[PDB]
Amino acid sequence: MKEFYLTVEQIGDSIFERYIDSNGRERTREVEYKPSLFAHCPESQATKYFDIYGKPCTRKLFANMRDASQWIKRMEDIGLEALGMDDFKLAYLSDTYNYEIKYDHTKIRVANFDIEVTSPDGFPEPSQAKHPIDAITHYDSIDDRFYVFDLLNSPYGNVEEWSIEIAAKLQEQGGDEVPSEIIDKIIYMPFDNEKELLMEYLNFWQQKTPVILTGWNVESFAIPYVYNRIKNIFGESTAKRLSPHRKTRVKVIENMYGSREIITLFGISVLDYIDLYKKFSFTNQPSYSLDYISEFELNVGKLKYDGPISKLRESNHQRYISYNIIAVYRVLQIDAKRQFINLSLDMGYYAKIQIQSVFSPIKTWDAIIFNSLKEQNKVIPQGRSHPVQPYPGAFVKEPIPNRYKYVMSFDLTSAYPSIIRQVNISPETIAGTFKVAPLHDYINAVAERPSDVYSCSPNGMMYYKDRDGVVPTEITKVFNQRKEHKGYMLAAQRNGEIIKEALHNPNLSVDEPLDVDYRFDFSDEIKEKIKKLSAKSLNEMLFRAQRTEVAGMTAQINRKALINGLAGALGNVWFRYYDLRNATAITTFGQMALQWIERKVNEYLNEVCGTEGEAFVLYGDTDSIYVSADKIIDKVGESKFRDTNHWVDFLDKFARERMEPAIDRGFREMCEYMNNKQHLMFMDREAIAGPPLGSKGIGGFWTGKKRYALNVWDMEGTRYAEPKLKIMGLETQKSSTPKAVQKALKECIRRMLQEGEESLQEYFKEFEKEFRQLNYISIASVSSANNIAKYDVGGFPGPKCPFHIRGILTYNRAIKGNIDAPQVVEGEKVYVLPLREGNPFGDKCIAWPSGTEITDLIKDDVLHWMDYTVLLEKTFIKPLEGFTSAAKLDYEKKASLFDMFDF
DNA sequence: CATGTGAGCAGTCCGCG
DNA sequence: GCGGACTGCTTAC
Ligand SMILES: [Ca+2]
Ligand SMILES: [Ca+2]
Ligand SMILES: [Ca+2]
Ligand SMILES: [Ca+2]
Ligand SMILES: [Ca+2]
Ligand SMILES: [Ca+2]
């Protein structure tokens, strides 16, 4: 097989690499890497090395990496550019793997672990590690086994061995319900003392050394705790055995009272699943406990236990160990669905970087561009220092706040990357500048044509048309990958709706789910078979289609983020190719594009409808337009339509057959105007929206910029079995909004858009009558707890103290000297509840760690002093007032002359 | 060590016979 | 109480 790296590190003048050899065996080696960098030399000196602007360079080969670094300093002092890849391990990988890496994940040791630590005096701080580690579960991907290390004797209690028989039993039968599919994969190892446990753990570690290390919060808890605990018991050099090169660095975050730390294990790639999830999932959650996220992703119940976690081991060691095991499995279950490890490995090896550098789009693109240029013997520019400078972005149209009955939306496919490719924006394709007219003059086609030779953006930049740029070249590769996966995602989504439609009439049979590939639209013959399947088989198929769609979502959305990241990186001062000329060339062109196409669409629709000067485009944001379709529907007349799907079909066809071509003509004309390299502005229809035919639903409304809701029947070619709400910016979409208020507000919207005013009014009345019966957690607001210390003045709020921070301080005083009430962690999320006047907490609100029940000693008082009136007003009524005034609708029946009668 | 800008809302402070 | 000014948080692109 072809060889590939696992990890790489620079340690002094040595590169330390772990890799897989030609026989599929894991190997390690230390290489005294001799790097090269480059300097500009005279034209009269012949050479095969040129910088990206075609200037000749000479290669300086160094005896070691220190010499290379030292030379960079001297060049800095002299005043001359030192070119080439200055991160030497990227150069090493590039030299060592001079081909497209094709890796085999079954050879890559992926470890998932978590530890338990009983602590009777508050949270067990990793920096101090003053308590025994009393459980570790460590799953190994190569063995496919859960290695369980169990401490039976501790100064906090001696317990009996864990029972696998009992673990496997249902909870309703006193067991722990450890999933049957992992029971046979558990290797249980009990220990009579911690020193033996830890030593065996370390020996195990040496035999099965993680390449990818993950788990939930392993970076800020598990890893530093294990490191510091081992350090305290055996000494630091023993702790260093967790690194295969015996090297670690300790990062100490001292904030202000007290301190925590991150540990870097050289030769391991740590990908904390919490960080993967945040970066790659595109959710914002009110809590990031594993219980919350597991329920969210997997619909599995919370791991239930009686009493505090500090007492769980002594009172119920059996459950304690089972839950340690299950927690580890849950991360594997989430990854099976989301496939973030796979994504990370894909992106890592594609770029030729340390796998953990997938968290940095700058490192990732720097590597991709370096490798690309190196293949043509080109030499990369030196990184430079730049002051941070704000610069202009997108254009957003101010919408008239209103209800909007029929709406069709369109937006550009991969807008910024497509602009890069169309214009040919790269560091080395800059041809010069031209004198800019006001943007409005370009939008209206009255400015002088910028150039009849070069490819232009209305920011004033010109680019070569007749040569490729590395930025366009490399961004197109990732875009094309993105597009493939998105095709699979949408097919799977369309396939899902076919199955949902068939679930309306399930057959009374015993059959199996069809063996099909969900990434491709079902053939007619598969669709016929589906119409004969049972409910059980159809639901299994619907599950598989949805898992296929999720996998496609992961792959497409993060490749999308990566290419958009390149456009953004051009405006980050730490990016080697930082250049506001290129960053603003993209954004300014975007602004022109949106406003140009708005004009063209208004022109076209006035023409086909026989009118003049009516505004069909009601909103737009960056690269999208929202077209009121009312006059289109009225042109034919609503009476002509047989059902909702008939008008949806009609608008879909109108968009595809009449609008999109007119849009394409408009953008081709714009491409000619700007003399661009290639026409890539593809503005495809997104949503078709309206009320159900014959209903009093209003279809949609806007309250303002970035705030709207649409009743959608077809989305990018997916015709829904049941209409779906597209809501942007409104409180339903905000993680700060209480969970039950999100629900209620969404149902208020659903009723507005699908049913009308009377339906709304009925629901609003019920919700107000029952609000006070909702669970306190379901109606608590959420906020991130940043800069808590700044406003902490003897446990009381300093000046400008934010509401949520004030609540935290209130909580701190109420739990003061409580030996095990959860502490609010800086930067994490909290629930927030307002408090009525005269409460015993002595302030207007309280805040506690999100995803948790508030500690029992103050829970009773919080429940008693909760200000429901304020809570209802702020979180529910005030937003709904915004929705309904915007829609010209009332959520309570207005008083009128009719109130004189008895109806 | 390091993707970007645009924009609304909820909060505090401050003014207000 | 209720605006305007300022800013933090969260989010749509
Ligand atoms: Ca635990
Ligand atoms: Ca788009
Ligand atoms: Ca059927
Ligand atoms: Ca868009
Ligand atoms: Ca699209
Ligand atoms: Ca109490």
Side-chain angles (χ1 to χ4, degrees), chain A residues 1-248:
Chain A
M1 65 186 299
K2 254 287 148 91
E3 299 193 352
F4 62 94
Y5 68 93
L6 293 172
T7 65
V8 63
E9 303 286 10
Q10 183 189 343
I11 302 173
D13 294 339
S14 283
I15 292 295
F16 276 91
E17 177 189 17
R18 299 169 67 200
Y19 70 105
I20 300 303
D21 70 20
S22 63
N23 291 309
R25 166 157 280 282
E26 180 173 336
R27 306 277 292 284
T28 308
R29 65 188 163 201
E30 187 186 5
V31 171
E32 292 176 18
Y33 185 56
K34 283 158 270 179
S36 299
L37 298 162
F38 306 75
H40 290 122
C41 64
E43 209 72 61
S44 56
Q45 193 193 310
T47 183
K48 64 183 162 95
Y49 302 111
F50 297 86
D51 76 4
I52 68 186
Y53 313 107
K55 304 292 95 193
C57 301
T58 186
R59 175 159 88 111
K60 303 272 168 180
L61 209 216
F62 294 95
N64 57 55
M65 279 176 286
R66 277 155 198 163
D67 289 346
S69 293
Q70 286 286 86
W71 181 78
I72 295 186
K73 298 186 201 287
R74 288 199 294 285
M75 290 290 285
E76 182 207 300
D77 292 343
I78 291 167
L80 296 158
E81 188 175 7
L83 297 85
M85 174 52 66
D86 57 313
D87 185 346
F88 302 116
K89 59 206 182 299
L90 293 190
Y92 170 90
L93 290 185
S94 190
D95 288 339
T96 308
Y97 300 97
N98 204 69
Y99 49 81
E100 189 183 339
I101 292 167
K102 151 56 175 121
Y103 68 96
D104 170 17
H105 79 87
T106 67
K107 310 297 197 194
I108 298 176
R109 192 171 303 271
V110 184
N112 200 290
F113 83 130
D114 202 5
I115 69 170
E116 307 298 332
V117 178
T118 295
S119 172
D121 52 41
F123 181 83
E125 290 299 333
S127 67
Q128 313 313 126
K130 74 183 170 187
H131 303 100
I133 300 174
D134 54 26
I136 306 170
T137 296
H138 181 121
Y139 172 85
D140 181 284
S141 68
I142 289 170
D143 298 352
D144 185 31
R145 290 294 180 276
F146 298 79
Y147 296 92
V148 180
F149 300 75
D150 187 7
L151 182 63
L152 304 188
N153 300 316
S154 163
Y156 306 134
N158 300 351
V159 292
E160 306 300 339
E161 289 190 19
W162 167 82
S163 168
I164 198 168
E165 288 74 14
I166 293 178
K169 289 189 202 168
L170 297 182
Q171 293 202 352
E172 296 91 339
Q173 205 195 18
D176 306 315
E177 218 163 312
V178 172
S180 59
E181 74 272 14
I182 73 178
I183 286 296
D184 290 347
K185 298 183 176 181
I186 297 166
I187 292 164
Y188 174 66
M189 291 164 285
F191 293 85
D192 287 332
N193 68 83
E194 190 185 8
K195 285 177 189 195
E196 277 287 354
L197 191 156
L198 291 172
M199 274 296 161
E200 205 63 17
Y201 189 61
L202 277 181
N203 296 133
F204 165 81
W205 191 279
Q206 318 298 79
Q207 302 314 303
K208 300 171 199 283
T209 312
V211 165
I212 307 298
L213 184 53
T214 188
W216 200 261
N217 224 41
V218 296
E219 180 151 286
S220 60
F221 180 70
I223 294 167
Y225 201 95
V226 175
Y227 185 76
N228 283 308
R229 188 66 182 170
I230 289 181
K231 167 148 72 76
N232 294 339
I233 296 164
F234 300 103
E236 189 164 48
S237 57
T238 295
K240 290 202 213 285
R241 289 172 57 206
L242 292 170
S243 164
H245 313 306
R246 306 302 184 256
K247 180 165 170 62
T248 59

Side-chain angles (χ1 to χ4, degrees), chain A residues 30 44 116 170 173 250 314 356 374 386 396 404 423 431 457 519 523 539 638 640 708 713 715 721 853 858 865 883 896:
Chain A
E30 187 186 5
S44 56
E116 307 298 332
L170 297 182
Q173 205 195 18
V250 179
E314 57 191 272
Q356 63 266 39
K374 168 165 168 285
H386 312 275
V396 187
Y404 289 92
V423 181
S457 171
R519 300 174 299 168
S523 63
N539 287 132
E638 263 197 1
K640 267 78 146 71
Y708 62 90
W713 303 89
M715 181 71 85
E853 293 284 331
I858 68 176
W865 288 93
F883 308 166
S896 78

Side-chain angles (χ1 to χ4, degrees), chain A residues 776-793:
Chain A
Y776 76 113
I777 284 159
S778 75
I779 55 178
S781 296
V782 179
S783 189
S784 294
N786 302 315
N787 307 311
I788 301 164
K790 199 204 300 201
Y791 307 90
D792 189 348
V793 181

Side-chain angles (χ1 to χ4, degrees), chain A residues 411-416 482 560 623-624 716:
Chain A
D411 72 286
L412 289 175
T413 295
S414 198
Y416 281 14
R482 186 257 173 151
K560 156 175 179 176
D623 69 330
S624 58
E716 293 190 320

Side-chain angles (χ1 to χ4, degrees), chain A residues 857-858 860-861:
Chain A
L857 57 135
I858 68 176
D860 50 324
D861 292 295

Side-chain angles (χ1 to χ4, degrees), chain A residues 502 505-507 530-533 538:
Chain A
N505 296 111
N507 294 63
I530 280 163
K531 291 173 198 162
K532 298 179 161 59
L533 290 174
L538 288 177

